[PDB]
């Protein structure tokens, strides 16, 4: 099940000069394009093998458009600064996101477009992609401005067409990377606390995509309430990691088994510590 997202962050820096603007695009958990106003040559550039091939017209348009986004959001930073009656010496952050999700069949299941100001939700396009939701009174101003401009149509047009269309294009160019799931290499570790207990840690390494289910069972049953679970983390090579732990009394290890569920596994494997 695939999706494509574009995110951006405009961070004002009074004194430091003009606002920094960075943007990037992803297909699933893979970044394929990046832009940074700070670069000696601000331009959208490839980050995934399956898009490096796109012609020069592509990069010229991707770049030209994103620079325009930068200019617009910089203008937005001061406009919102006006709405909230804020100092001109304080730093502020305007974040943007847009994206489309495809179903199993590859059709547009849901679209999105949202703005957040200084960490909080500001303006969002609703699920219907035909209306907006303001988070507060300032956003109500932006909302009316969006309605009076009938821009929703322009955004959903993008979400229903280009977004889905190009998502398919990328999914094919990188069929090997994007439509392939690497199963997690897994094992359990033992961590003795003197002689009265120990922690059993279950590892899932080098897998992709990131979605995964790790749980501990005692005599077949989820100890889900006493299980330690770390946020899934990037290994740095494109794959991910995750572990789950559970403190148990010495001499009760075998009563515990780790359940691992991943897209790249024929069937959820079951693990147990080996003495």
């Amino acid at each position: 099940s695939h999706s494509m997202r574009y995110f951006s962050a405009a961070v004002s820096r009074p004194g430091r000069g003009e606002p920094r603007f960075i943007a990037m695009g992803y297909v699933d958990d893979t970044q394929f394009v990046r832009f940074d106003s700070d670069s000696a040559s601000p331009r959208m550039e490839p980050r995934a093998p399956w898009v490096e091939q796109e012609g020069p017209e592509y990069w010229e348009e991707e770049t030209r458009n994103t620079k325009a986004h930068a200019q617009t959001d910089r203008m937005n930073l001061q406009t919102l600064r006006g709405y909230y009656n804020q100092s001109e010496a304080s730093s502020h952050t305007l974040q943007w996101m847009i994206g489309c999700d495809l179903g199993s069949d590859g059709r547009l299941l849901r679209g999105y477009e949202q703005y957040a100001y200084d960490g909080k939700d500001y303006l969002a396009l609703n699920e219907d992609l035909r209306s907006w939701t303001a988070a507060d009174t300032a956003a109500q101003i932006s909302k009316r401005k969006c309605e009076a401009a009938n821009v929703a149509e322009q955004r959903r047009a993008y979400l229903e067409g280009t977004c889905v269309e190009w998502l398919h294009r990328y999914l094919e160019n990188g069929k090997e990377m994007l439509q392939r799931a690497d199963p997690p290499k897994t094992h359990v570790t033992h961590h003795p606390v003197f002689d009265y207990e120990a922690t059993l840690r279950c590892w899932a390494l080098g897998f992709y995509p990131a979605e995964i289910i790790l749980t501990w069972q005692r005599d077949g049953e989820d100890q889900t309430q006493d299980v330690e679970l770390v946020e899934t983390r990037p290994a740095g090579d494109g794959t991910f990691q995750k572990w789950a732990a559970v403190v148990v009394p010495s001499g009760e290890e075998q009563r515990y088994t780790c359940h691992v569920q991943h897209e790249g596994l024929p069937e959820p494997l079951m693990l147990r510590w080996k003495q």
Partner: peptide
Amino acid sequence: RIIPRHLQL
């Protein structure tokens, strides 16, 4: 392919 413009808030 990225949408052409950002909304003028």
